[PDB]
Amino acid sequence: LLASGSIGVFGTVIVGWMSNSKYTVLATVRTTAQLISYELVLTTVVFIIALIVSSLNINVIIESQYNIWYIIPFFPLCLIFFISALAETARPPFDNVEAESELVSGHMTELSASPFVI
Amino acid sequence: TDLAKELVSGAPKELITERVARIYQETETWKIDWDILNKGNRWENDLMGYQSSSDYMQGTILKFDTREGAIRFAKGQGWDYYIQEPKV
Amino acid sequence: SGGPVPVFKKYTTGSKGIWEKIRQLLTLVPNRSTGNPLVKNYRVPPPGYYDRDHRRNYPRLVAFDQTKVSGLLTLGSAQNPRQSVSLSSTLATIDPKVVKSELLAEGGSPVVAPSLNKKMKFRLTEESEHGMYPEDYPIRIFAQN
């Protein structure tokens, strides 16, 4: 699950690359330096949960919360996970990738029609 | 008077040569306006009867104060002109 | 004084029934309205010579140049009497006692620039008075005193 997240991170930095340089390449060193850094915090949170169950299997993690939900002991982690979840996806408030008031449409200003849909 | 100020006013070349300005007096002050074009001053638009025009100096009138002041201006800009003396 | 005001004194849509008491338990500030106007009161019925002349007596346009300026110190004033006549020579040869009453005011003290409104006097106010931000906020409120 974490490895597939990294590929999408590398998938995004391709968007602002070599397709001229007006607004996509402005938000590609900015983009890359953001979803790189929070991928550390997101990864650590996942491992701390997996440390509690000593397993890397999602079913085991789910089935091991029968008597307790990790929102109770690990409330700070849920906030930290969600903050990192927002920043990785580039959703606001951490939305300087497609900074609408600053970079028009951000990295998708070149994208139109099917490239935009995907 | 000797100054070629037409190179700083930005006016088109046609004002210096092909246009004539009248310095008249309608009852205490003098005015300057440009005489009408030969053709194309006013043609009836065939759509709605609007009074079309290609002359861009038709709506321009300059209110002066004294005769010599107006003549000073016309020489300063390099304008061809003539003066109409009012009847007493 | 614009203190807090209950919800039922504001012309807005309210809450009828137990939902009012539900609203007063969940909402952070119970004395705020939803903002929707009162349909039953707001916009209910729709909208369906000389003695009196001053322009001709406008203040005149008079310009004071160096010629007329010199005349006030020498001849005096039209209330308290005392070509090209240059001022610079007059200032070089004239009685300073003329200066300390005509060209200057209050014993030669320079005339402060005339105020466009004298009664613009300010005082600093406090939180309990104007009901604005507390002190830590980086502004201060002034009043006309």
Binding site: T32, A33, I36, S37, L40, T43, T44, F47, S54, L56 | - | -
Partner: protein, 70 residues
Amino acid sequence: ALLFLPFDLEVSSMLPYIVSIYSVGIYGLIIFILFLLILIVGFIYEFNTKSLSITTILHKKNKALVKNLY
């Protein structure tokens, strides 16, 4: 960006301890804490030098006007 590479290898090298936290017992736990305290010194070092801050030195300079009577 460059400092991401070390800290990411640190986190991604704690994977073996996750699936074996029990069997290694106390001995693994003490080793694990040492493996972090060494990396904390790296964390401490970047904290003091202010290497992460974007910094603003190219501009925002002011001076006090001083009379130079002669």
